[PDB]
Design a protein around this ligand. Sequence first.
Ligand code: MG
Ligand code: MG
Ligand code: MG
Ligand code: MG
Ligand code: MG
Ligand code: MG
Ligand code: MG
Ligand code: MG
Ligand code: MG
Ligand code: MG
Ligand code: MG
Ligand code: MG
Ligand code: MG
Lengths: 292, 159, 204, 169
Amino acid sequence: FVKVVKNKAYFKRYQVKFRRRREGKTDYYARKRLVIQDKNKYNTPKYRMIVRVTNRDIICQIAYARIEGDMIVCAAYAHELPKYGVKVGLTNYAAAYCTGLLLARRLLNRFGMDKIYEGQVEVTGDEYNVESIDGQPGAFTCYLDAGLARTTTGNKVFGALKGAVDGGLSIPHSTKRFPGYDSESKEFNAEVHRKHIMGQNVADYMRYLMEEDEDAYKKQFSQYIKNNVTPDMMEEMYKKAHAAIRENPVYEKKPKREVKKKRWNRPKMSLAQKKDRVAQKKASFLRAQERA
Amino acid sequence: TNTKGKRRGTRYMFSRPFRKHGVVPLATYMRIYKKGDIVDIKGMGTVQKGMPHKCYHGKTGRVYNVTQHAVGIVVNKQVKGKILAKRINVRIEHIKHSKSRDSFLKRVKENDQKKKEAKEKGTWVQLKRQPAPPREAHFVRTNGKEPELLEPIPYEFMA
Amino acid sequence: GRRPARCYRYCKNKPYPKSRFCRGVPDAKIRIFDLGRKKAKVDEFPLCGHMVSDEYEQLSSEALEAARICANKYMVKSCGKDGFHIRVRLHPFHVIRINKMLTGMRGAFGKPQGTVARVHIGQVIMSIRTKLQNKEHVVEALRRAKFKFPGRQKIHISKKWGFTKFNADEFEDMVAEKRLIPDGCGVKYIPNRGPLDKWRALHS
Amino acid sequence: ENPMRELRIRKLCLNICVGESGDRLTRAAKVLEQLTGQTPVFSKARYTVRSFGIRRNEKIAVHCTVRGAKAEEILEKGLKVREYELRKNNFSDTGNFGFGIQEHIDLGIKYDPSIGIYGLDFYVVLGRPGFSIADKKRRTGCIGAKHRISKEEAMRWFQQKYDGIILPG
RNA sequence: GUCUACGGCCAUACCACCCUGAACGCGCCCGAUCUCGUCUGAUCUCGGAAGCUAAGCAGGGUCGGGCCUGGUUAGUACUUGGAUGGGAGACCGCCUGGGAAUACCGGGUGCUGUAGGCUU
RNA sequence: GAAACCUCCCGUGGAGCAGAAGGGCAAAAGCUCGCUUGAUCUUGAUUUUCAGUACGAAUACAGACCGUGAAAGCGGGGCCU
RNA sequence: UAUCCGGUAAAGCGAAUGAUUAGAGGUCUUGGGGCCGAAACGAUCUCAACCUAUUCUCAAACUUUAAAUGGGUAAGAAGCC
RNA sequence: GCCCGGAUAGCUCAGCUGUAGAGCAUCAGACUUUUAAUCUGAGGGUCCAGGGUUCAAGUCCCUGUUCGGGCGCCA
RNA sequence: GUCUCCGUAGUGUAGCGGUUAUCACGUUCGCCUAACACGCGAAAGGUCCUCGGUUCGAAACCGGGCGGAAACACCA
Ligand SMILES: [Mg+2]
Ligand SMILES: [Mg+2]
Ligand SMILES: [Mg+2]
Ligand SMILES: [Mg+2]
Ligand SMILES: [Mg+2]
Ligand SMILES: [Mg+2]
Ligand SMILES: [Mg+2]
Ligand SMILES: [Mg+2]
Ligand SMILES: [Mg+2]
Ligand SMILES: [Mg+2]
Ligand SMILES: [Mg+2]
Ligand SMILES: [Mg+2]
Ligand SMILES: [Mg+2]
């Protein structure tokens, strides 16, 4: 035995952490720096390009932050990319680009800066950013919101950033974290990035596996092999998707209805029920001990 | 004689209250102060940059400047026998909108509503406030049961 | 050796206890606050009488000791060596200063003389518990103790069972009901907030 | 008929605490490197102890976590040396266990009058699929209750997997 | 009905153990070619989608601790202003208005914004 | 071996933050690494002592030039007194 | 009449810090002294500190609570639209 | 502030840009019955610290840190 | 009361934050002597006054304890 640590005392004096800190989601240190505005700007927005990758998804949203709760103007998920051409490998870097680009075009059609601010159509991969036009409405500027990602080089986040940037959002960055950038040399290949953007780093993996061992390649790339998507059908495919995304981004939802409204969940037990149960439990205890 | 140090005797003044330590909840920042907005200053331990001086805690004033993350904020300060209006730059964290004014405005808006209406009607309505009056004549019905007697009760030493 | 108790009677100052700050405090006279059969269960001694003050004054540690002694001694000689339990109920905590004179009044803040209690009007000083036989001894025990204190105290023989916080008319009844439960010189009060496993220890 | 409460080995931690520094230490590191097939890491002292003769920040020991297959096999060896006997006390309440081998040649290495004989000390850290939520960065948490590995539960695992005895006393 | 992403207020939301989780999600999960990082692909980074709700997560359970909010405590303690009131003092009673906090006993145990799912 | 090093678990902070104490601080204001000189150049305003003079101390801005970071930002000495 | 501020009296210490009485319960820890033991967490006491619920009494330099009295604003034309 | 001076092995002191001297002290051999005394060897120098001049510095050069003797003294 | 300093094997004392705590005497054990002394060789022995702190580290530096010792206590 030992001194019990978590006594009444403990809990009495104990302060919870913020809810999303408790969840393990929001980094409040950054949130503050990121999100709140200068006061002499007053009410005017400060947008984000939220980018979050989830086990099988890539979510990219744009939000400023009102006191009630930060608001999403515009968002595109990975699992929308089927419409456009990407059928699998949707959590991967290339898809991130697609998502991030998508998000850009979608947002630039809403304000009607679709025809202005094309951005970068060729997909070089180089340092690019949007010079706002004069005699025209300016470019949309959001700052990247990386979450709890260790933001090394190669972090998919910077893919979706790239995508958006090439899509036509004025997001500040450096290239020091796109794939390519050589840590122990300090320049940038750009073509290396392009390859990652297009899936070649995936394609190459596929080829290396089929060479080495069929059973491993089949296990690794099942849904890739299914759908008939090869290493040599890949770069084209993404370029087609970017072309689809670029040409028609707007979202339509699904008209959800015909809901039965049954309670899957289990409702909370009313006082009297709870007050009953102990009555029963005490009575039950009494009748049991009145035998032996 | 005492020390004239800046923070002297703010042990319980700038002290985040019980189970409210830690992170400054964002709303605080993301809410907006213009010129002419009335504000009650109130120091806060955590944010030290731009902490207002102890004399101006609780004291309440108007906002005459707005820098990136601060506000210049005219307050009054009685110095012996000559109140000084004076102007102090305070970081947002140690500052709240005063509600003192809101309730006046609410009442102005209500008057201007009740002025627009009841003009076409002809009846002039009592807009002014009026003090809590003498409490009117009225009956007390003691239905059936007569009022209960109350005997004063004997002393006995408890402890 | 020590000043007369006239001079440190009244509650003139803020309390000044043996802390970080007030140190070098010579020890109190009174150390042993309870004596008799303090190993007695609640059932075998129900009848507190509580010498209870009526000033707002300070009683010396040295006084308490004498009183306690004077009460114990009379309780033994009367009822028996182990026929009761006493509980002194004012620990001296206030330290009481003394600027000694071989300069003048120059920088005269005292050294600590000793310790002392602070008693409110109606605070208990000493309370004894013993048997319903015994009450007349109990009072005289307390009577005699009173002389060892300044001010005024009123001996009162008082409703609770034992030393407990429970009214003696109800105490006999409660125990069978098991709202109260024996626990040395005191009694634990088991109430229906419980987790029911606790309830199932009783009734079984 | 459980799904994935498949009590496995998370890591086998090895260390050699010479408590000298200099040669014997770098000479010991060669033993772990040979054994494990991975450069080990030195651990410096917490604070100075005259009684032991170790200064603060003096490199005292050398150690090495091994995971996966190579950890399994090295666990196998060590148990062969201890002829598949462990004790109840060698199993911690948290579900893990360890033991020491008194000399490393008994494993499967050749002595050298230079690289003498380092005694070392295995510690097995048992896990379960979904024990990473502890130590990931984003949506951290505990690992439930009925998921934690009991002292009992490990002992029977060891008893089962390696045919071990677990002598009393 | 309920989830995810970003949130506001920051325990009515925390802690402990127990049950239950349709579909979508979120997860654990399986890999190390590349990107990236480790003594270690455990973490981090990346490529996946054979398993599985065991865990996280969600909903509930508990005469549960905690927290929340009422009652009681008590018109008690205190206290503004008043008297050529009392009392040797210590202190107290009154007038005039203001009025707490435990133990104790009840009830409650997240609400909610924006965007996008599932139950078609 | 009570103390060496290794491992798992608990831990509202009971540690640490140069120094007195008090405040404040946990994906930090603590520890560890990486790069750096905002401890630089310069107008005024304001606070604190105040007589509402100075000194010192500090708080907001503004213009230079730089550091750092993917960035939002942060920094013109030391978490604050 | 609206609306902030405050940590004093009080209260609290079965809430943090410190201070402190007593019995119940605990081989937690281990001991130092015993008695019955070769010795044995064996039996039996014991006193050390630690722990589980309890209990006695405290704080100018403690505090969850927390008044009275008290200090700020505001109650329109320099305002509304 | 100015001039000057010493710092070298345990200690006290030599040293003229190319194994750092003397004596004592320290340790092993003689002598002694043994010790001391004494004679022999042996070991021991960051030449106070840093930078330079120089092919090369313990020294020449500057810069410091000390250390002492004398001078000197306007916020 | 003030201000000061000192508390280290049996004794008297050294000790410059990292020591096996130095020196002398004393003690013990050999020899030398017939014996002893002197002498020679060996050995043992510090609670570094006490407690707390700082420090990676305190016998010392810093604080308070118990001891011990000088100088002052004047003008009426
Ligand atoms: Mg960050
Ligand atoms: Mg007299
Ligand atoms: Mg006084
Ligand atoms: Mg993995
Ligand atoms: Mg689950
Ligand atoms: Mg489940
Ligand atoms: Mg409850
Ligand atoms: Mg009068
Ligand atoms: Mg940080
Ligand atoms: Mg600037
Ligand atoms: Mg700092
Ligand atoms: Mg105060
Ligand atoms: Mg009080």
